Each structure stands twice: as structure tokens, then as C-alpha cells.
Amino acid sequence: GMLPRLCCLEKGPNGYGFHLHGEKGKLGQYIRLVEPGSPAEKAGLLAGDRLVEVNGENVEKETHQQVVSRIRAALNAVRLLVVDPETSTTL
Ligand SMILES: [Cl-]
């Protein structure tokens, strides 16, 4: 598998500045809509990143609601371990 990557976010006045988006039916929580100039952007989060851990807890087998709770639980910073999306395909 692709080497996961650690992103360490510092909570700003309007939160982190990203959407957490699920699939409906099949598991997996993905980052979307990383807002320009946000803490998420500055921490290196990318749209299409698959979220593997929140503060060192694997969240691959957690519901959307549980993952949101884990991110919101953190007082002023959150560590997110992600797997970045593929950028090269041969056709
Ligand atoms: Cl991905």
C-alpha cells in the first residue's frame, strides 16, 4: 500500500477548513474541499485523501459520526494520518 502520510493541523477560528465525506454502503472517509489558506491546507491535506488515523487511533472501521466525534474531541490540534490518492494511470 501507499505510504500513509501524517498531517498535523492547528485549529483556527473557524475550525480546520475541510469536509469529511463518506461513501454510503461501503466504508472509507475522505477529505474534500480543503479551503484556501486554511489550517487543513497548511498541514498539507489534499482532496481525495483517505483518512486512516485520528490522533493515532485507526478510524478505518469507524462510522462517519464516530470519526467526526474523534476530530471534534481534540481541543486545539489534530493529527490526521492519510493515504493520498493516485496521480498516475496508464491508459
Ligand atoms: Cl486516497
Nearest to 28 by CA among 56, 63, 1: 63
Q: What is the 77 CA–ligand 1 centroid distance (Å)? A: 22
Ligand 1 centroid from CA 85, angstroms: 4
Resolution in A: 1.1
Distance 48 CA to ligand 1 centre (A): 5
13 CA distance to ligand 1 centroid (A)? Answer: 28
* Residue 6 region by backbone torsions, left for phi larger than 0, else alpha for psi between -120 and 50, else beta: beta
Method used to obtain the model? X-ray
DSSP notation for 33-64: -PPTTSHHHHTT--TTPEEEEETTEE-TTS-H
- Residue 25 is classified by DSSP as S
Terminal alpha carbon distance of the chain: 21
Q: Is 48 exposed, middle or buried (0-12, 13-18, 19+ CB in 10 A)?
A: middle
Instruction: Name all domains of the chain by residue range, CATH numbers in brackets.
Output: 1-91 (2.30.42.10)
Handedness of CA 77, 13, 67, 46 (dihedral sign): negative
